[PDB]
């Protein structure tokens, strides 16, 4: 009812820039944009009242773009799809390091 009209983002998380390994891609997430948190005035702990605080990152997951879209539409959420960026493999040669500079101009 109340939590079924929130709008979500369906996306496939990119690769971390701090590591060269590509083993965390291919997954599709549903982002609930839970951005209502504050500090508890006793210990400084981070508080929330939003039930979808971490379920979008901890438990819910999808192996395909279609599966995430189907799940969102069955529950009635308004979704926007962000297509992932992919690298373009280009021709690289080690011999390029020693390319001739040509005749002196």
């Amino acid at each position: 009812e109340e939590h079924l009209s929130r709008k979500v983002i369906i996306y496939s998380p990119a690769r971390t820039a701090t590591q060269s390994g590509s083993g965390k891609l291919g997954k599709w997430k549903i982002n609930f944009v839970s951005t209502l948190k504050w500090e508890n005035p006793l210990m400084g702990w981070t508080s929330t009242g939003d039930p979808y605080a971490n379920v979008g990152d901890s438990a819910l997951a999808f192996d395909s773009e279609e599966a995430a879209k189907s799940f969102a539409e069955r529950h009635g959420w308004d979704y926007k799809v962000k297509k992932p960026n992919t690298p373009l493999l280009k021709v690289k040669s080690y011999s390029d390091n020693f390319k001739w500079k040509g005749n002196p101009q």
Binding site: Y11, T18, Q19, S22, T86
Partner: protein, 244 residues
């Protein structure tokens, strides 16, 4: 098979393509691709440290060694061009043993710093040690040690962790266009530095933090503040200029 990371491959012409075998499976790559790039198209993840797609090939870490048929030695896939009919094997006892031996040499002088190191939890060296070299350590001698260097208020330096991949040096020359970083000395005593005391002034200097595979170059303003597993990641855009 899906190329690693979903990477796209562009073909100038279907005529300009060659056939190689990656672990028996057959892949088609453009002419001029390396053995490592062919392995990515096959969907096989080769371990690497010195190789960066956006930097010139160096071939010094020796972690990308694979077995090539009719080749007498293990082959550094990051530098070796792919040839038609090439048979590339990555999980053979020769390739696995090469990876374990190199990983042993990498950790020989590496400092026991994972607890105090900001790369901990997002470290290629940690992940590849757990995966490829599952060696019980047998190095009992004295480790080498290096003094830290001052590069300014953005890049914190712990140079005992450096594995001498030269990604930072190559980035400084090729991408930043400011030639301040070099590799000084020779042998196991070689040190990355600027030799004379100078700060990294390039406006792209902070990118050496991302490319350093170990915690040798880290963000000074982010130092010790968080572990990567406790951070929520949001994909967005920058509004500091008109580039997005």
């Amino acid at each position: 098979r899906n190329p690693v990371g979903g990477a796209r491959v562009h073909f100038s012409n279907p005529e300009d393509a060659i056939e190689v075998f990656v672990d028996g499976y057959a892949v088609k790559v453009p002419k001029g691709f390396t053995v490592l790039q062919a392995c990515e198209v096959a969907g096989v993840d080769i371990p690497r440290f010195c190789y960066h797609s956006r930097l010139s090939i160096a071939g010094n870490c020796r972690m990308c060694l694979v077995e090539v048929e009719k080749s007498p030695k293990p082959v550094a896939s990051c530098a070796m061009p792919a040839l038609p009919g090439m048979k590339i094997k990555t999980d053979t006892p020769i390739a696995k043993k090469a990876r374990e031996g190199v990983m042993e040499f990498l950790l020989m002088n590496h400092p026991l710093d994972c607890p105090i190191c900001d790369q901990g939890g997002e470290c290629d060296l940690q992940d590849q040690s757990m995966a490829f070299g599952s060696d019980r350590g047998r190095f009992t001698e004295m480790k080498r040690s290096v003094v830290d260097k001052n590069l300014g208020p953005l890049v914190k330096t712990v140079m005992t962790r450096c594995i001498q991949c030269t990604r930072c040096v190559r980035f400084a020359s090729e991408v930043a266009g400011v030639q301040d970083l070099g590799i000084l000395g020779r042998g196991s005593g070689e040190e990355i530095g600027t030799y004379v005391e100078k700060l990294m002034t390039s406006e792209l200097s902070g990118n050496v933090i991302d490319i350093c595979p170990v915690g040798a170059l880290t963000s000074k303003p982010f130092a010790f503040k968080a572990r990567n597993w406790e951070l929520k990641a949001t994909e967005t855009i920058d509004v500091s200029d008109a580039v997005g």
